[PDB]
Design a protein around this ligand. Structure first.
Ligand SMILES: NC(=O)C1=CN([C@@H]2O[C@H](COP(=O)(O)OP(=O)(O)OC[C@H]3O[C@@H](n4cnc5c(N)ncnc54)[C@H](OP(=O)(O)O)[C@@H]3O)[C@@H](O)[C@H]2O)C=CC1
Ligand SMILES: Nc1nc(=O)c2c(CCc3ccc(C(=O)N[C@@H](CCC(=O)O)C(=O)O)cc3)c[nH]c2[nH]1
Ligand SMILES: [Co+2]
Length: 159
C-alpha cells in the first residue's frame, strides 16, 4: 500500500519558499495519526523543512529521496530511487511536489486536507498532484481549525 498525504490551499499550492504558508494543528495531528508506525518517504527539500527536533519524525521509518549519493539525513535512510523505499506493508509519501508526482503511479490512497485559504499560484510554488478519473474521492464536512482557517478532509481511493 502506497498512500500520499498532503495539505493544500484551494488553488493547489502545497509549499512556498521552502515551507508552508499556514499551520493547522488539527491537520498535523491527522498527519501524525495516519503515518504513525509506517514508512514515510519524502523529498530532500521536505526533509530540509523539518525542524531539528522532529527530525526524524518519531515512530516512523523516515526515508529521504535524493540524487546526492553522499547526502546525510541523521535518523533517516537516504535512497536514490523511490522503488527502494517501498518495502513495508504501508508506505506514506509525504511530499513534496516533485515526489508526489513521482509516486502517484504507485499510489492507491490520497489523504488530502483542503485548507480554505485563497492563495494564488506563484512561480516556484510546490503544487499538489492532479488526480485523474481513476480516483474515487469521498469528502468530509468543513471544519474550523483553531488557527482560524476552515479545512476539510478528502479520502481518495483507487484499485
Ligand atoms: N503542504 C504539504 O502537504 C506539503 C508541503 N511541502 C512543501 O513542499 C516544498 C518541497 O516540495 P518540492 O520543492 O517539490 O521538493 P521535494 O520535497 O519534492 O524534494 C525535491 C528533491 O527530492 C529529490 N528528488 C526528486 N526527484 C527524484 C528522483 N527521481 N530520484 C531521486 N531524488 C529525487 C531531489 O533531491 P536532491 O536535490 O537532494 O537530489 C530533489 O531536489 C516545501 O515548501 C515543503 O514545505 C512538502 C511536503 C508536503
Ligand atoms: N495533511 C498533511 N499536512 C502536512 O503538513 C504535511 C506535510 C509537511 C511535512 C510535515 C508534516 C508533519 C510535521 C509534524 O510536525 N508532525 C508531527 C505532529 C506534531 C503535532 O501534532 O504538532 C508528527 O509527529 O507527525 C512536520 C512536517 C507532508 N505531508 C503532509 N500532509
Ligand atoms: Co496506520
Amino acid at each position: 500500500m502506497v498512500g500520499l498525504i498532503w495539505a493544500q490551499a484551494t488553488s493547489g499550492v502545497i509549499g512556498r519558499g521552502g515551507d508552508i504558508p499556514w499551520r493547522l494543528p488539527e491537520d498535523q495531528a491527522h498527519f501524525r495519526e495516519i503515518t504513525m508506525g509506517h514508512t514515510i518517504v519524502m523529498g530532500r527539500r521536505t526533509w530540509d523543512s523539518l525542524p531539528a527536533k522532529v527530525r526524524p519524525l518519531p515512530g516512523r521509518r523516515n526515508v529521504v529521496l535524493s540524487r546526492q549519493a553522499d547526502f546525510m539525513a541523521s535518523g533517516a535512510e537516504v535512497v536514490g530511487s523511490l522503488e527502494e523505499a517501498l518495502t513495508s506493508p504501508e508506505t506514506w509519501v509525504i511530499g513534496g511536489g516533485q515526489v508526489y508526482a513521482l509516486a502517484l503511479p504507485y499510489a492507491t490512497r490520497c489523504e488530502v486536507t483542503e485548507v480554505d485559504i485563497g492563495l494564488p499560484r506563484e512561480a516556484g510554488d510546490a503544487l499538489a498532484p492532479v488526480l485523474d478519473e481513476t480516483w474515487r474521492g469521498e469528502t468530509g464536512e468543513w471544519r474550523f481549525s483553531r488557527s482560524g482557517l476552515r479545512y476539510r478532509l478528502y479520502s481518495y481511493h483507487r484499485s
